[PDB]
Design a binder for this molecule. Structure first.
Ligand SMILES: CCCCCCCCCCCCCCCCCC(=O)OC[C@H](COP(=O)([O-])OCC(O)COP(=O)([O-])OC[C@@H](COC(=O)CCCCCCCCCCCCCCCCC)OC(=O)CCCCCCCCCCCCCCCCC)OC(=O)CCCCCCCCCCCCCCCCC
Ligand code: SF4
Ligand code: SF4
Ligand code: SF4
Ligand code: SF4
Ligand code: FES
Ligand SMILES: [Mg+2]
Ligand SMILES: [Zn+2]
Lengths: 208, 125, 97, 112, 176, 386, 96, 115, 230
């Protein structure tokens, strides 16, 4: 168990558990769940309506002081009724800690823009909108950031195909670059790698 | 504030999929069969959504396998058949669903290999 | 290196340093392009006894995250995420550039 | 007395004790308008009272900075203003109310 | 543990003021920079006479791919397809069948050199040292089609570069 | 009406494919609108279709000046998710090559900044040193830049039998090259005029906008991830953290030069403290076995086959792992669903936030000052666009 | 073991040669067709069969760690020879 | 019921009002677009294309979907006005290098296997 | 009713009398490693890969053959079960040939997968390996007997499902071999199924040999038209 196994830290685990309990007690209106991962990573699941309060409390509270937003992104899980999972990562320099705040939304429900709380979010929320199609309410200048001008659809969504729907080429008759339906000389070859034998008993799900 | 929308969910006009790949497509919602070359069952736990097979041809150079189907590789994983059906319905795809097939419980008995008068007795072991 | 000593003196005077002491071209002090073969030590799991994999399986010791305060289910002193950071010290080597 | 706080845009504070006392009194005044059983109120009152006692008991700025663990008293002043603004916001938000909505049964279930 | 890069105060004595005035009016630091460039003018340039002189390389160098043989002249590749499975760019295409003598050999072995990232994962994955990245790097073509390698081209590369490839492998295989 | 100008992508000062749409009154910059995505390759979706070993060479090509630092961040994320531990010699190799990579990145940043400003000479002096470090990269992995040496289990191969001596020979001459660079730039009144009080950002603004690395330290914020949240063997080396006073381009330049010196210090320590032992985790269900074992033992062959076809499975879970990359905090949000392919990989690049703040930092400045600010933010668009 | 087709095109070890009515031959006009001349099936057919005085032999292709994985070949059948599945070398016991 | 949260409009009337406003803005923009991009189309062709794009989505009955469609159309209009778009992007609406794909059964049967 | 309560890892379940430990573990969704047990063949118990620990019992039992007893507590992940699996995999791999790159079973091997999942990652076997001569049982089933792990699935299928008694084991101990002992063609309308049930590359498809690997294949679930059974 010594040489090749990653060592544990129970002190940080206890501190993060206590602080998660602290946050949950202070904001019962929005906090739905609190988790401490095995490698000491605090996670706080909330209600979407509490995006702005929670973050504000987390960045302003004397005992919190998470004044820096590492990054903000989204995860697509099609099996969930609320497709998109919004993940905020925050860093506290005063207490040398990190915290993760997660909420959910679907295709037609906006999330409150948090540019007011953190200036850094601007481009992160633009990127989430571009890649996933999640609208952010009250956003200063919301528009595509990564994709091409006039590009239809959101690439990061699970349903979207890897190579998309159109390609580009230069056409001499019209003397310009044109977009046409994708044709591939060699199709991407899909591999089935998943082993039919279970790897991790600790994560086994009930047999329904 | 809530506005009480009354209609069925429909997001086709927002996804950006060309209409050809919305109307002429058929998806299959199914639990994949166990690979008969192995005994593990871990690949028969989740529901899958996959599209219909389209034309593949031979590249004049190198003889590679060419396709013009953008959804030829897309496979979606769902917890339950209801989630898969809801996803296909809100995306506007015609679907075919297949009920999950489970192996029936079998009555095993080692001692039956040595039956006094039964046909089950093993001629070798 | 290889050059006239008067040019070396002019170089040193213009640059302000003795250039020859630290030449930037590698003349002959670098390793040979052919070396003896290595031997490479084995790892700690290369034992012949008392090495069952179940006692050195790091992947199988990972567990799902520990749940605190599920919503679906005394003074109580306030707490922080971690103790405050200690202030940094000012580089006893060279504090000011 | 001290020049160069060292952080760009953070001016040196003359008379920081008075500023800290005023800010902490304002914070307690705002907390007085929150329901007494709310966790935010009691936690913030406890920490604010400790900080105010420390400020009142220590006339020396560097010794007070070492007691407060807040990093260069100008930053302590800034954090006090931040807490006051948050207190007003929390008064408006009322996050001590019961959870607004319960999420779907499989919403946070992972994997899948 | 930290240091300051711009927290130094200048002396205000008359000598220091006069030195700074001389620096301002007579441009001393500019002459210092001129002296540095003049010093570099009289050094030997670090340029090499390419193509006559080449840059140094290593036995681990990753270059053009090649298919190798056993000393008997039989191909090493047995069509396990591990290189095709591991390739992050999907640059390898393999088709196999039993040979006329029942041997397990490839009938198609292509590498798309404009897909390849030259990572060397395939030669790590190969269990019989059949596919290698040889030492060559001067194989620019005039057309795109010349960079779509089939089995004949890769076997020819192996035949052409075996003498150096074997010597490179002998010098590095004990680190692998 | 303000004049509207396209700055890039085909511009020398652009530092890549950037379309900076600028509103100007005369030469004064009224507004900066960075248009990015000209190097968005869809890396994260591609990473979703790969195994964990197949996704590693993408992190080489995120920030193409700090390859091994990108590899180390990803490897740390995957090792944290696997609950395994790299061996000590591998960690020392990782820190040594991370400091060499920091030297590479800082040379590139400082010299390209000087080249934009107009001082073209130091670039040629420092790129010979960059060439020698590329040679170090090549000897260890066979590649000059996209090495792919750092793997989620340690490193791919052990150092060749004479590499430490050559690294020592290079490291004992580099300080004079830094000195020549500083003679060229540090006290030049023209350079100070082009850099002092240009692009001044306050500590509060730097924190809120999401800045990291030098963009924080030039404004006096005392934060270095190697000191506060150490990884590998960074807690066992000694070095100082440069800190600025004014938050301008000049202070950021001094910080980077001193950072280069401190990296030399760390390299010297790593050279004198490299321990013996194996280079990857002695766990053949994660790290491939040696080839002699693969050709003699049945288990080793089975594990080689499975690790190179399917790859190792990672237990389900999500991590955010961050390192102090030479351009700032570099992070990975990695989500595993239990299989051998990552479910999600979000990449956090400091250049994203720095470029999002470029418009703020250029208020009340001219065209040349905006060029200097782009240079001082140390932007590579591979990590910005991904 | 090279040999030309009735069209004059060399036939590869794989055995593929373009048919008479196949337009794709136009890709070789004014250029050449890449054909490797060392046929492996013929070269391995020239190696002499190794005679060993044991029922089970071992093969690793030569060179130790530079060959293939080590395998064991049974040599009880006397109507044939034991053939390595990796290298193609042949082994037999002293017979008759 | 159905417990949904709006984006901008509470019923289809407000959504239709926003659609009309966006249509007015596109209609006004078309001549300037033809002038600035030096397009070889007429203003009549551009306005016809704008109408065709609007009518592509005439079947939508959800105010939230309509709000998102108006947001996307406003994004495209802002993009066109500021010249972020190039002539190739504007001309991508007309599919000038795409051969007409038939819709009747017999031609589809002749060309290939796809329906 | 007649159901009895047993526990798998401390969790209660109701099972029919005579149910084996393996089936009870399957009720809670846990799959016990196996090589010789097939739910459509008669129980053999020979491979010994299914050995599990019952709480308060010193001896591990074979889960595929042992009927659950009321009040029993199976422990599928205890140290004893894991060490049993590791030892049995070690004995299975001792004489196995290093054939994975040339074996058609390569990416579809139960032996490979269970070695990766339940066995060790190393070999401490320092002897020579056994090698056996190949059998020829016709043009459909390729035979590479060295790979055989002696599961005996082929023998039970041929005797019970196919109705033929051509397969068997000759010799004993280490030298025991699976075959026909004479030049015989195992020809029957259900013969090819012995390729599916054989867990290793000992029995493979001769028409399919060397053509593909499992990870590259695309699977289309369809129906047969060669007769009226569908
Ligand atoms: C008027 C000043 C010209 C003096 C001069 O050209 O050489 C100065 C010569 C240059 O020394 P250096 O190259 O720094 O020393 C190392 C030699 O290069 C190392 O010597 P080398 O082995 O490289 O010598 C090669 C040799 C032959 O090389 C050539 O063929 C070059 C001829 C091309 C020039 C036309 O160099 C020459 O003879 C040409 C010298 C000038 C030819 C013009 O030194 C002096 O004699 C002092 C010159 C005045 C100093 C101020
Ligand atoms: S070097 Fe890498 S990309 Fe190129 S063929 Fe080999 S595995 Fe594929
Ligand atoms: S080159 Fe090597 S890895 Fe690739 S198919 Fe041939 S033997 Fe297998
Ligand atoms: S049967 Fe399985 S373990 Fe044996 S050689 Fe074939 S793939 Fe490898
Ligand atoms: S040939 Fe296959 S099925 Fe028959 S005994 Fe051997 S391993 Fe079992
Ligand atoms: S599966 Fe039980 S002994 Fe083989
Ligand atoms: Mg089989
Ligand atoms: Zn051999």
């Amino acid at each position: 168990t010594r040489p090749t196994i990653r060592p544990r830290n129970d002190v940080v685990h206890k501190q993060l558990s206590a602080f998660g309990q602290y946050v949950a007690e202070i904001l019962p209106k929005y906090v739905q769940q609190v988790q401490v991962s095995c490698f000491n990573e605090l996670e706080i699941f909330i209600h979407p309506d509490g995006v702005i309060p929670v973050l504000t409390f987390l960045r302003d509270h004397t005992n919190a002081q998470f004044k820096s937003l590492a990054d903000l992104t989204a995860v697509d899980v099609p099996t969930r009724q609320n497709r998109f999972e919004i993940v905020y990562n925050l860093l506290s320099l005063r207490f040398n800690s990190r915290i993760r705040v997660k909420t959910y939304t679907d295709e037609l429900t906006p999330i409150e823009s948090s540019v007011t709380v953190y200036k850094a979010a601007n481009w992160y929320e633009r990127e989430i909108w571009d890649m996933f199609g999640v609208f952010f309410a009250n956003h200063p200048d919301l528009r595509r950031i990564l994709t091409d001008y006039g590009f239809e659809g959101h690439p990061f969504r699970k349903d979207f195909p890897l190579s998309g729907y159109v390609e580009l080429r230069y056409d001499d008759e019209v003397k310009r670059v044109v977009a046409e339906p994708v044709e591939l000389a060699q199709e991407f070859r899909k591999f089935d790698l998943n082993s039919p034998w279970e790897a991790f008993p600790a994560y086994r799900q009930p047999p329904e | 504030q809530l506005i009480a929308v009354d209609e069925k969910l429909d997001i086709t006009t927002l996804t950006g999929v060309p209409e050809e790949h919305i109307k002429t497509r058929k998806v299959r919602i199914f639990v994949p069969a166990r690979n008969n070359m192995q005994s593990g069952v871990n690949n028969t736990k989740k529901w899958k959504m996959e599209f219909d097979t389209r034309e593949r041809w031979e590249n004049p150079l190198m003889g590679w396998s060419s396709t013009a189907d953008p959804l030829s590789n897309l496979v979606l994983t769902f917890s339950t058949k209801e989630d898969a059906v809801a996803f296909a319905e809100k995306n506007g795809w015609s679907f075919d669903v297949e009920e999950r097939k489970v192996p029936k419980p079998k009555s095993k008995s080692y001692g039956a290999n040595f039956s006094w008068n039964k046909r089950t007795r093993v001629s070798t072991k | 290196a290889s050059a006239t000593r008067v040019i070396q003196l002019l170089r040193n005077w213009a640059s302000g340093r003795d250039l020859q002491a630290k030449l930037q071209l590698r003349y002959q002090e670098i390793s040979k392009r052919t070396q003896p073969p290595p031997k490479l030590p084995v790892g700690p799991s290369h034992k012949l006894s008392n090495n069952y994999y179940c006692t050195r399986d790091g992947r199988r010791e990972a567990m799902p995250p520990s749940i605190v305060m599920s919503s679906q289910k005394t003074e109580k002193k306030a707490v922080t995420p971690a103790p405050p950071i200690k202030r940094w010290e000012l580089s006893k080597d060279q504090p000011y550039l | 007395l001290k020049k160069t706080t060292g952080l760009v845009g953070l001016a040196v504070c003359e008379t920081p004790h008075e500023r800290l006392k005023i800010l902490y009194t304002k914070i307690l005044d705002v907390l007085g308008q929150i329901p007494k059983n709310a966790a935010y109120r009691k936690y913030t009152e406890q920490i604010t009272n400790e900080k105010l006692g420390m400020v009142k008991a220590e006339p020396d700025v560097k010794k007070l900075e070492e007691q407060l663990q807040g990093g260069q008293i100008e930053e302590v002043i800034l954090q006090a203003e931040n807490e006051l603004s948050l207190a007003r916001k929390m008064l408006r938000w009322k996050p001590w109310e019961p959870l607004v909505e319960e999420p779907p049964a499989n919403q946070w279930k992972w994997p899948i | 543990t930290y240091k300051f890069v711009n927290m130094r105060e200048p002396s205000m004595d008359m000598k220091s003021v006069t030195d700074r005035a001389a620096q301002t009016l007579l441009w001393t630091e500019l002459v210092r920079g001129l002296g540095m460039t003049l010093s570099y003018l009289f050094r030997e340039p670090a340029t090499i006479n390419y193509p006559f002189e080449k840059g140094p390389l290593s036995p681990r160098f990753r270059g053009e791919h090649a298919l190798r043989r056993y000393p008997s002249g039989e191909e090493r590749c047995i069509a396990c397809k591990l290189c095709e499975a591991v390739c992050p760019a999907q640059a390898i295409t393999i088709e196999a069948e039993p040979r006329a003598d029942g041997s397990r050999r490839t009938t198609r072995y292509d590498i798309d050199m404009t897909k390849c990232i030259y990572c060397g994962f395939c030669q790590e994955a190969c269990p019989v040292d059949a596919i290698v990245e040889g030492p060559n790097f001067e194989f620019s073509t005039e057309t795109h089609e010349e960079l779509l390698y089939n089995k004949e081209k890769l076997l020819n590369n192996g035949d052409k570069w075996e003498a150096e490839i074997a010597a490179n492998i002998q010098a590095d295989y004990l680190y692998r | 009406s303000n004049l509207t100008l396209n700055f890039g992508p085909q511009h020398p000062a652009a530092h890549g494919v950037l379309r900076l749409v600028m509103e100007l009154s005369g030469e004064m910059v009224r507004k900066c609108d960075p248009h990015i995505g000209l190097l968005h390759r869809g890396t994260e979706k591609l990473i979703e279709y790969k195994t964990y070993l197949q996704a590693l060479p993408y992190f080489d090509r995120l920030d193409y000046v700090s390859m091994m630092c990108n590899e180390q961040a990803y490897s740390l994320a995957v090792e944290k998710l696997l609950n395994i531990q790299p061996p000590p010699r591998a960690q020392w190799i990782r820190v040594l090559f991370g400091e060499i990579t920091r030297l590479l990145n800082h040379i590139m940043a400082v010299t390209t900044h000087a080249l934009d400003i107009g001082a073209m000479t130091p670039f040629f002096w420092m790129f010979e040193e960059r060439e020698k470090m590329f040679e170090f990269y090549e000897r260890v992995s066979g590649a000059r830049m996209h090495a792919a040496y750092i793997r989620p289990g340690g490193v791919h191969q052990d150092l060749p039998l004479g590499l430490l001596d050559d690294i020592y020979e290079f490291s004992k001459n580099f300080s004079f090259r830094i000195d020549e660079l500083e003679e060229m730039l540090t006290n030049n009144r023209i350079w100070r005029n082009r850099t002092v009080d240009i692009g001044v950002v306050t500590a509060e603004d730097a924190l809120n906008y999401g800045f990291s690395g030098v963009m924080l330290r030039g404004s006096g914020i005392q934060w270095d991830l190697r000191k506060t949240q150490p990884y590998d063997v960074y807690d066992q080396v000694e070095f100082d953290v440069p800190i600025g006073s004014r938050g301008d381009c000049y202070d950021r330049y001094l910080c980077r030069v001193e950072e280069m010196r401190q990296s030399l210090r760390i390299i010297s320590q790593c050279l004198n403290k490299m321990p013996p032992g194996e280079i990857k985790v002695d766990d053949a269900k994660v790290s491939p076995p040696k080839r002699a074992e693969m050709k003699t033992s049945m288990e080793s062959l089975i594990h080689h086959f499975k690790l190179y076809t399917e790859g190792y499975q990672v237990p389900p879970g999500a991590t955010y792992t961050a390192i102090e990359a030479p351009k700032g905090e570099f992070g990975v949000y990695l989500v595993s669903d239990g299989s051998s392919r990552p479910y999600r990989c979000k990449i956090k690049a400091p250049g994203f936030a720095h470029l999002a703040g470029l418009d703020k930092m250029s208020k009340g400045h001219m065209l040349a000052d905006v060029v200097a600010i782009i240079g001082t933010q140390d932007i590579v668009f591979g990590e910005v666009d991904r | 073991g090279v040999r030309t087709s009735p069209t004059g095109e060399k036939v590869t070890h794989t055995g593929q040669a373009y048919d008479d009515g196949d337009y794709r031959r136009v890709r070789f006009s004014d250029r050449q067709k890449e054909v490797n001349e060392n046929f492996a099936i013929d070269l391995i057919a020239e190696q002499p069969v190794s005679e060993v005085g044991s029922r089970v032999i071992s093969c690793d292709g030569g060179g130790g760690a530079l060959g293939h994985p080590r395998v064991y070949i049974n040599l009880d059948k006397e109507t044939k020879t034991g053939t390595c599945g990796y290298c193609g070398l042949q082994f037999r016991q002293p017979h008759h | 019921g159905t417990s949904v949260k709006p984006i901008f409009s509470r019923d289809m009337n407000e959504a239709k009002r926003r659609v009309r406003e966006l249509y007015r803005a596109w209609y006004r923009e078309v001549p300037n677009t033809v002038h600035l991009f030096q397009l070889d189309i007429s203003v009549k062709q551009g306005r016809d294309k704008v109408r065709e794009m609007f009518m592509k989505n005439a079947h939508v009955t959800d105010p939230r979907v309509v709000d998102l469609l108006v947001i996307k159309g406003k994004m495209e209009l802002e993009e066109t006005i500021n010249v972020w778009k190039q002539r190739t992007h504007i001309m991508r609406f007309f599919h000038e290098t795409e051969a007409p794909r038939p819709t009747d059964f017999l031609s589809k049967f002749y060309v290939g296997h796809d329906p | 009713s007649n159901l009895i309560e047993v526990f798998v890892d401390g969790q209660s379940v109701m099972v029919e009398p005579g149910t084996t430990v393996l089936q009870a573990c399957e009720k809670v969704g846990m799959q016990i490693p196996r090589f010789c047990y097939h739910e459509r063949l008669s129980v053999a118990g020979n491979c010994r890969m299914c050995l599990v620990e019952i709480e308060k019992a010193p001896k591990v039992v074979a889960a595929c053959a042992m009927p659950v007893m009321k009040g029993w507590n199976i422990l599928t992940n205890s140290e004893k079960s894991k060490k049993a699996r590791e030892g049995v995999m070690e004995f299975l791999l001792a004489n196995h040939p290093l054939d994975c790159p040339i074996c058609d079973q390569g990416g579809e091997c139960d032996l490979q997968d269970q070695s990766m999942m339940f066995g060790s990652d190393r070999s401490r076997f320092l002897e020579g390996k056994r090698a056996v001569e190949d059998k020829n049982i016709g043009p459909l089933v390729k035979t590479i007997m060295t790979r055989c792990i002696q599961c005996t699935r082929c023998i039970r299928f041929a005797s019970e499902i196919a109705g033929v008694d051509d397969l068997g084991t000759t010799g004993r101990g280490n030298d025991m071999q699976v075959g026909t002992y004479i030049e015989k063609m195992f020809m029957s309308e259900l013969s090819g199924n012995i390729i599916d049930i054989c867990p290793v590359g000992a029995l493979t498809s001769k028409p399919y040999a060397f053509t593909a690997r499992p990870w590259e294949t695309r699977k289309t679930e369809s129906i047969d038209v060669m007769d009226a059974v569908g």
